[PDB]
Design a protein around this ligand. Sequence first.
Ligand SMILES: CC(C)(c1cc(Br)c(O)c(Br)c1)c1cc(Br)c(OS(=O)(=O)O)c(Br)c1
Length: 262
Amino acid sequence: LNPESADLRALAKHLYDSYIKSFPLTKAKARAILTGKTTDKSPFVIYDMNSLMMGEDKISKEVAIRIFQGCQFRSVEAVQEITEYAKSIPGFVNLDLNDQVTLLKYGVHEIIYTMLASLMNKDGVLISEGQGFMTREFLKSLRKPFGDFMEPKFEFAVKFNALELDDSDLAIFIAVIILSGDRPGLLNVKPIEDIQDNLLQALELQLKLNHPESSQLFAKLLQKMTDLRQIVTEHVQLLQVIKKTETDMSLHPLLQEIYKDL
Ligand SMILES: CC(C)(c1cc(Br)c(O)c(Br)c1)c1cc(Br)c(OS(=O)(=O)O)c(Br)c1
């Protein structure tokens, strides 16, 4: 209702727009699939080995390793999407190239897991663009090293999902994440911090208007960044372990570039 906020709202609408355009599977779609809505169709459920083998009919000499390779390839694609989304954050392409690379390097994983929560409930996670649903227990039942990779994400998702954020909230939130001045090796932090200040102002107003009855959701939302960091650290530690165990296992280069010095 005033010039300043009017501009923030425009920023919010801009980001939501690019968000829809960049990410095929939104939380709205995911939620309609997971809760039995007639706007979307129900997923084939993978809860053990037979259903796994059956799912390939409906949707590396070891299922645990090919499930892992599946997630890594889906991550590579995710990076591509986030990158596409980042270019649309006003000011981002105008930054030093080196810093754009740096912002993406430390930003993608925190964003992947933020958005992964949209495809999860306490029982499992959507796969193959919402055509599949792989249960938590089946993932946990995977052999030593791989049985542990998905659990920390489920823990995060259940608490994050309690915030009850929709896509328009998330659009701004993942932009705040990308534009973090504290990232290691940033040449010029000042222009980055000015953009973030703007996003944070937009997120704050968005949360007020969207969740008026929700006290300190802004503060609560920002505190989730601690859990995100911890997820990423554990993940790369787990990967360090995999590389010694499976020397025949290959990590995508784009992913390996992102992992080193993390
Ligand atoms: C949710 C899951 C299992 C998934 C989702 C869709 Br959709 C699929 O099509 C498939 Br196959 C698998 C997944 C797991 C991880 Br671990 C991951 O990134 S990672 O954590 O950086 O490796 C990402 Br991205 C996605």
